[PDB]
Amino acid sequence: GCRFCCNCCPNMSGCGVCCRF
């Protein structure tokens, strides 16, 4: 159960996997 996000950490100019909502 995870979702793609484009603002989790100030070290990636794109999107990553997010599991906290």
Structure tokens given for 7: 């603002």
Enter the DSSP assignment of 5.
Answer: E
* Residue 15 to residue 12: CA distance in whole angstroms: 7
Is 1 buried (19+), middle (13-18) or exposed (0-12) by CB count in 10 A?
Answer: exposed
What are phi and psi for residue 20, nearest 5 degrees?
Answer: -110, 120
CB atoms within 10 A of CB 16: 13
18 near 1, Cβ under 8 Å?
A: no
In the three-class reduction of DSSP (H, G, I as helix; E, B as strand; rest coil), residue 1 is classed as coil
In whole angstroms, what is the distance from residue 4 CA to residue 6 CA?
A: 7
In sequence order, what E strands does 1-21 have? Answer: 3-5, 16-18
Give the position of tokens 């484009």: 6
| Token pair in block for residue 16 | 């990553």
Strand pairing class (16-18; 3-5): antiparallel
